[PDB]
């Protein structure tokens, strides 16, 4: 139901509104408010995941709304192609940034309601365009500012829309 038109192709996402209600609603809102238009996948790590939704070209961090509670304990594993919320070490700090697993990453799953075990909340999955994710994951990257794994050439989310 969500379409991410990027300069590498279009990624279509299906959200799990019931299994991760607060997270799905938070994401959909950002899309609706056009917050993701013009953002990049600033952290691309082959064999791990691709993260975006927080920076504009030149690593310019956008403002966000208040954090959301962590819904990682919903029984959903960080399987290949699932989308989940990136965050601060603080479990309940997720805001606008998300990542798409490019590999089964069980280690990211909730194990306990503890600082280190809270895990990362899966709230959807790439329904169409997994090939787009497969290509993005292997693009050239390098360090910039206090960021590593930044794509040499910007991977841009031109527009995100609810369909």
């Amino acid at each position: 139901s969500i379409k991410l038109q990027t300069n590498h192709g279009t990624i279509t996402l299906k959200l799990f509104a019931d299994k991760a209600p607060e997270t799905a609603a938070n994401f959909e809102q950002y899309v609706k408010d056009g917050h993701y238009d013009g953002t990049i996948f600033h952290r691309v790590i082959d064999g791990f995941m691709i993260q975006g939704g927080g920076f504009e070209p030149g690593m310019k961090q956008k403002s966000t709304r208040a954090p959301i509670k962590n819904e990682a304990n919903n029984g959903l594993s960080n399987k290949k192609y699932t989308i989940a919320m990136a965050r601060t070490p603080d479990p309940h700090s997720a805001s606008a940034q998300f990542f798409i697993n490019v590999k089964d990453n069980a280690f990211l799953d909730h194990t306990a309601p503890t600082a280190h075990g809270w895990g990362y909340a899966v709230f959807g999955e790439v329904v169409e365009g997994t090939d787009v994710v497969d290509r993005i994951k292997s693009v050239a990257t390098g360090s910039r500012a206090g960021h590593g794994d930044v794509p040499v050439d910007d991977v841009i989310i031109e527009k995100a829309e609810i369909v």
Binding site: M49, A86, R87, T88, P89, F99, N105, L108, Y120
Partner: peptide, 4 residues
Amino acid sequence: AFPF
């Protein structure tokens, strides 16, 4: 910066 997470997940690490």
